[PDB]
């Protein structure tokens, strides 16, 4: 009978990849991508549209295929790749997203180093296919949040070593495509860590400096003040920024942090900005987070990022979302799931969907997870579902995304 990934099998009979690495990225990503698009109820047409777009637009910027022991520029999306799938679950339905670090082979071979050009090459193709994508924020924010030529001359290798052992990747930019039924919306992430290593500034300062340069009037100013005071009280210096690649007036900004202390308490604190967020949605969500944290038994690692990376454990993360006319900043919790067995996570997620009146999601969650990882044993797997994001508004209800790691 007709396999779930028939669209991948079909396109494979028609596409000619110009090199082995694109080929390998296609056969590595497209199967699971095809399946998620079926699960999320995308039309057959929209399924081919986005698989084909993946082949044509994304595969060429995923870089050399990172076979074990191969000396190429490395990234950590999806665990060890330059690309990572994720899936959003809501009452209104499911949506697939694909995040990746644009990269070309020149970054592996001495001819870029901090990989600053590939994203520009990528946006120049993307904007041909999706007219709504506006890269004005890329041109505005790069200077504030990524390593300039002047920053690079003032860098020394003892400070780059120290950032790499703590954080691993030289990555400045990630891009993500939200594959919405109403058309792609592209998002860009900026990573100021290496810039900050060279300048002596903090990541948060850089991120809030970036926002204020773009927000000439100050509609986002009080929202910024609020988050900035929490970062200062909680002694947090590292941060990174995301934005929608749409007209600057209509974009949303999101400031990410990472805390290595994976306790519910530390999550509670960040979630409420230390008690500065008082809205009803934020209190209803906190009580849900308490239930999920407990049930999932999210694992406390150590603070040392050496021995945390050894055991394959991840920190907690949050982003605080800001938009022009927004009254309060909107929090989102990223809970780490590595070291938790995929059947356990499916048992909880299925019961969570039951509780919050999402029977369609509950009914198929497990069999879908199994088909993404066909043939594999989900009681023995711990590193397939890697993050669960959470957010809540009274109108739309619970917002949760699962971020997937590629199988070993």
Annotated binding-site ranges for dimethylallyl diphosphate: 97, 187, 189, 254, 256, 334, 399, 403
- For residues 103 and 175, the answer to whether their CB atoms sit within 8 Å is no
Site for Na ion in 306-345 (CB under 5 A): 337, 340
Nearer to its own copies, 128 or 249 (CB): 128
188 contacts ligand 0MV (rule: CB under 6 A)? no
The nearest distance, CB 16 to its own copies, in angstroms, is 5
- For residues 249 and 324, the answer to whether their CB atoms sit within 8 Å is yes
20 contacts its own copies (rule: CB under 8 A)? no
Q: Which of 4, 24, 48, 260 is close enough to bind its own copies by CB under 8 A?
A: 48
Judged by beta carbon distances under 5 to 8 A according to partner kind, the member of ligand 0MV, Na ion, its own copies, none in contact with residue 77 is: ligand 0MV
Q: Which of 81, 83, 176, 348 is close enough to bind ligand 0MV by CB under 6 A?
A: 176
Judged by beta carbon distances under 5 to 8 A according to partner kind, the member of ligand 0MV, its own copies, Na ion, none in contact with residue 39 is: none
- Dihedral (C-alpha) 373, 75, 137, 178: value to the nearest 10 degrees? 0
Integer Cα distance of 374 and 88 in angstroms: 21
Binding residues for ligand 0MV, how many (CB under 6 A)?
13
Nearer to ligand 0MV, 169 or 378 (CB): 169
Give the N- to C-terminal CA distance of the chain in Å, as an integer. 28
Judged by beta carbon distances under 5 to 8 A according to partner kind, the member of its own copies, ligand 0MV, Na ion, none in contact with residue 141 is: none
Place of tokens 């993360």: 317
Integer Cα distance of 98 and 186 in angstroms: 10
76 contacts ligand 0MV (rule: CB under 6 A)? yes
Q: Which residues are annotated as a binding site for substrate?
A: 76, 84, 191
191 contacts ligand 0MV (rule: CB under 6 A)? yes
Q: Which of 5, 11, 195, 244 is close enough to bind its own copies by CB under 8 A?
A: 11
Nearer to ligand 0MV, 102 or 398 (CB): 102
53 contacts its own copies (rule: CB under 8 A)? yes
CA angle 122, 383, 78 (to 5 degrees): 5
103 contacts ligand 0MV (rule: CB under 6 A)? no
Which region, judged by CB under 8 A, interacts with its own copies, from 3-11, 69-77, 99-107, 133-141? 3-11
Q: Which of 85, 174, 316, 349 is close enough to bind ligand 0MV by CB under 6 A?
A: 174
Q: Which residues are annotated as a binding site?
A: 76, 84, 97, 187, 189, 191, 254, 256, 334, 399, 403
The nearest distance, CB 337 to Na ion, in angstroms, is 4
The nearest distance, CB 252 to ligand 0MV, in angstroms, is 15
320 contacts ligand 0MV (rule: CB under 6 A)? no
Question: Mask of contacts with its own copies, 107-136, x by CB under 8 A?
Answer: ------------------x--xx-------
For residue 332, the cross-strand partners are: 319
- For residues 392 and 281, the answer to whether their CB atoms sit within 8 Å is yes
Task: Name the site residues for its own copies (rule: CB under 8 A).
Answer: 6-7, 10-11, 13-16, 44-46, 48-50, 52-53, 56-57, 125, 128-129
């Amino acid at each position: 009978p007709i396999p779930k990934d028939i669209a991948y099998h079909t396109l494979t009979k028609a596409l000619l990849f110009p090199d082995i690495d694109q080929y390998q990225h296609w056969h590595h990503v497209a199967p699971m991508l095809a399946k998620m698009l079926v699960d999320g109820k995308y039309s057959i047409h929209q399924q081919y549209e986005y698989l084909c777009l993946f082949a044509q637009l994304v595969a060429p910027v995923l870089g050399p295929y990172p076979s074990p022991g191969r000396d190429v520029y490395r990234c950590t999306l999806g665990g060890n790749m330059t690309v990572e799938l994720s899936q959003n679950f809501q009452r209104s339905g499911s949506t697939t997203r694909i995040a990746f670090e644009p990269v070309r082979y020149q970054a592996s071979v001495g001819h870029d180093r901090f990989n600053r050009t590939s994203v520009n090459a990528f946006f120049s193709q993307l904007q041909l296919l999706v007219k709504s994508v506006n890269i004005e924020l890329h041109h505005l924010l790069s200077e504030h949040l990524t390593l300039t030529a002047k920053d690079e001359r003032n860098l020394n290798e003892e400070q780059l070593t120290k950032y790499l052992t703590n954080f691993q990747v030289k990555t400045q930019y990630v891009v993500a495509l939200d594959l919405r039924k109403t058309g792609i919306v592209a998002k860009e992430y900026f990573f100021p860590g290496i810039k900050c290593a060279a300048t002596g500034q903090t990541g948060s300062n850089a991120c809030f400096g970036a926002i204020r340069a773009v927000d000439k009037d100050g509609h986002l100013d009080s929202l910024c003040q609020l988050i900035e005071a929490h970062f200062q009280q909680s002694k947090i210096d590292d941060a990174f920024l995301c934005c929608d690649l749409v007209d600057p007036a209509h974009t949303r900004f999101k400031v990410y942090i990472a805390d290595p202390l994976v306790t519910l308490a530390r999550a509670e604190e960040h979630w409420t900005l230390g008690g500065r967020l008082t809205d009803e949605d934020a209190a209803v969500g906190l009580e849900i987070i308490r239930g999920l944290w407990s049930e999932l038994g999210i694992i406390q690692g150590p603070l040392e990022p050496s021995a945390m990376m050894e055991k394959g454990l991840l920190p907690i993360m949050l982003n605080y979302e800001m938009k022009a006319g927004q009254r309060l900043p909107k929090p989102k919790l990223y809970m780490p799931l590595t070291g938790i067995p995929e059947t356990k996570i499916a048992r909880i997620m299925t019961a969570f969907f039951q509780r919050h009146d999402m029977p369609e999601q509950a009914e198929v969650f497990m069999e879908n997870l199994q088909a993404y990882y066909e043939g594999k044993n989900l009681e023995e797997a711990t590193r397939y579902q890697a993050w669960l994001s959470f957010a809540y508004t009274k109108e739309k209800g619970p917002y949760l995304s699962i971020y997937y790691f590629w199988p070993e």
